[PDB]
Amino acid sequence: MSVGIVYGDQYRQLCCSSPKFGDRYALVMDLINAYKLIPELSRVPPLQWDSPSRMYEAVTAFHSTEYVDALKKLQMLHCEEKELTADDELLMDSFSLNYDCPGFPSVFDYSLAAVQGSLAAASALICRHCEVVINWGGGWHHAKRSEASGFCYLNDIVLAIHRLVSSTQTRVLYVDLDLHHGDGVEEAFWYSPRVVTFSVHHASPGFFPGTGTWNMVDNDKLPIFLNGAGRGRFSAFNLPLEEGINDLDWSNAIGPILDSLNIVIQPSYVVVQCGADCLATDPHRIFRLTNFYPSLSGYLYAIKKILSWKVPTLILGGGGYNFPDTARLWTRVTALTIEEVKGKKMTISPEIPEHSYFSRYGPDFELDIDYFPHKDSIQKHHRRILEQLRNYADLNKLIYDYDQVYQLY
Ligand SMILES: CN1CCC2(CC1)c1ccccc1N(Cc1ccc(C(=O)NO)s1)[C@@H]2c1cccc(Cl)c1
Ligand SMILES: [Cl-]
Ligand SMILES: [K+]
Ligand SMILES: [K+]
Ligand SMILES: [K+]
Ligand SMILES: [Zn+2]
């Protein structure tokens, strides 16, 4: 069927207006355009609201009115020469609108743009206009009800998933491939069995945001994983991985888990956060994934497997602090999505085509990232996860082969 992609003139300008992500969104969409992919894609315009009240209702489906009010005020304050008052500094500090989530003149418009894009993408799936929709301006998984976190101001993902589950029993499987734990999405749906969250990430002492690993409590008892609560018990899945993992080991770590979640949950929709900060070339320098398509990119391995399910899917961006390598990865994800969904082979030249941002792709100007890969707790994680999935299934009265599922591992 049809693959949609979110873009527009205003949308691009807003997505390029933040100090942390600068013109990343422009490199991504211009590289997709340089490879002649735009004619294969259905343009999905960002959602717009008939009034301020309708916009406030949509965003406050998740966020608190006082947080939305403070974010709106932070934008007003940064569009003026006047320094903040003592009480304004306190208000903004109370919502963590500082440190990693500072103010800037477009902070509200920028944050809301991601929401507009991901809501339009979910709408395009719900009405069956597209089988898959991509939004490289979204995936801000850390934003919480009343707190900015990890340069995430509004949780476009939580709001898109809310629109999906609220449609016509609808289950959503959320897969978070970002280097960082998908805490804001996991927390939003902590009490729901209808949205199952799965995050693979780095976890280590002092690494942001600290969650998605063993629960640290006062007793000498063996630590265990919190995995949701009430009717949501066992519905939040996490795989924390040590630094240094390559394409093949990360692919082997997640593949059986993805296969099992799909078979047991039978989701109506899949939402994938594809944060590019696991790339070997990300300045975090934690994981050693690639965008290679020959050893297969772990990212391309995961997207190909997800798309093989033929479940309507939303693919989102997220982290990725090496802008040219993020564009390299996300162009290949976009081409792979065209190939799997349209059944139309896409031949991408290994040389970056000439375009405005061509100089940004030095020094080799090739599509492969400039990295040469070289030379379990995971098996333990696999047994724990498999037991969690059996627990989730039993609690939610789902029937499944279980021998078939045990075999995948
Ligand atoms: C405002 N505040 C409320 C409480 C939090 C976060 C936001 C929250 C919000 C919504 C639903 C559940 C939860 N909690 C319970 C958990 C959900 C996910 C957890 C985890 O460790 N997963 O890996 S712990 C969070 C929490 C509680 C205590 C310590 C830590 Cl680190 C995190
Ligand atoms: Cl654009
Ligand atoms: K474009
Ligand atoms: K993640
Ligand atoms: K859940
Ligand atoms: Zn990240």
Q: 3-class SS at 350?
A: coil
Instruction: Check pocket membership of 55 for ligand 1, CB cut-off 6 A.
Output: no
Tokens 């932070």 map to which residue? 74
CB of 328 within 6 A of ligand 1: the answer is no
Ligand 1 contact, 235 CB (< 6 A): no
Buried b (16+ CB within 10 A) or exposed e, 21-47: bebbbbbbbbbbbbbebeebbeebebb
Encoding tokens for residue 311? 């479940």
Three-state SS for 342?
helix
Tell me, what DSSP letter sits at residue 381?
H
Closest CA to 331 of 63, 29, 100, 53: 29
List C-alpha distances in Å: 271 to 16, 94, 204, 228. 23, 31, 26, 19
* CA distance between the termini of the chain: 31
Q: How far is the CA of 297 from the centre of ligand 1 (A)?
A: 32
Tokens of 162: 């809310």
Contact 121, 6 (CB under 8 A): yes
Q: Which residue has the tokens 């924390």?
A: 240
- In this structure, the number of other CB atoms found within 10 A of the CB of residue 127 comes to 9
Note whether 273 and 141 are within 8 A (CB). yes
CA 302, CA 182: separation in Å to the nearest integer?
A: 17
Atom of ligand 1 nearest to the CA of 144: 7
Full strand arrangement of the beta sheet holding 195-202? 42-44, 3-6, 132-135, 313-316, 269-273, 172-176, 195-202, 236-241
Task: Report how far residue 135's alpha carbon sits from residue 117's, in angstroms, rounded to the nearest whole number.
Answer: 7
DSSP codes of every residue in 81-142: SSPPPHHHHHHHHHTT-STTS---TTHHHHHHHHHHHHHHHHHHHHTTS-SEEEETT---TT
Sign of the four-CA dihedral 19, 21, 25, 30: positive
Is the distance from the beta carbon of residue 208 to the nearest atom of ligand 1 less than 6 Å?
no
Count of the separate structural domains present in the chain:
1
Task: Determine which one of 63, 78, 141, 142 is catalytic.
Answer: 142
- Ligand 1, atom 31, lies closest to the CA of 211
* Resolution value in angstroms: 1.8
Give the whole-angstrom CA distance, residue 338 versus residue 345: 8
**How far is residue 308's CA from residue 310's CA, in Å, rounded to a whole number?**
5
Reading the block at residue 234, the tokens are 């066992």
Minimum CA distance residue for ligand 1 atom 30: 211
Q: Does the beta carbon of 238 sit less than 6 angstroms from any atom of ligand 1?
A: yes
248 vs 105: CA distance, rounded Å: 43
> For ligand 1, what atom is nearest to the CA of residue 145?
1
382 is in an annotated binding site: no
Q: Select from 9, 24, 53, 4 the least CA-distant residue to 276.
A: 24
Q: Identify the H or E element spanning 12.
A: helix 9-15
Structure tokens at 60: 């406050």
Q: Whose CA is nearest to atom 15 of ligand 1?
A: 187
**Structural determination approach:** X-ray
Which H or E element spans position 173? strand 172-176
* DSSP 8-state symbol, 397: T
Which residue from 149, 155, 187, 235 has its CB within 8 A of the most atoms of ligand 1, so it is best to mutate?
Answer: 187
Residue pair 315/266 in contact (Cβ under 8 Å)? The answer is no
The pocket of ion ligand 2, defined by CB under 5 A, consists of: 7, 12, 29
Does 142 participate in catalysis according to the annotation? yes
What's the rounded Cα separation, in Å, for the pair 38 and 24? 18
How remote is the CA of residue 30 from the centroid of ligand 3, in Å? 6
CB contact at 8 A, 130 and 42: yes
CA dihedral 31, 198, 192, 165 (to 10 degrees): 30
Q: Taking the alpha carbons of 290, 292, 297, 299 in that order, is the dihedral positive or negative?
A: positive
Domain that holds residue 29: 1-409
How long, in residues, is the chain? Answer: 409
CB 390 within 8 A of CB 264: no
User: Which of 161, 154, 124, 162 has its CA nearest to residue 137?
Assistant: 154
CA 274 to chain centre: 5
3-state helix/strand/coil string of 28-63: HHHHHHHCCCHHHCEEECCCCCCCHHHHHHHHCCCC
Q: After which residues does a break in the chain occur, C–N more than 2.5 Å?
A: 168, 294, 375
In angstroms and rounded to an integer, the radius of gyration of the C-alpha atoms of the chain is 21
Strands 42-44 and 172-176: unpaired
Alpha-carbon distance values, 224 to 198, 215, 257, 388 (Å): 17, 6, 19, 12
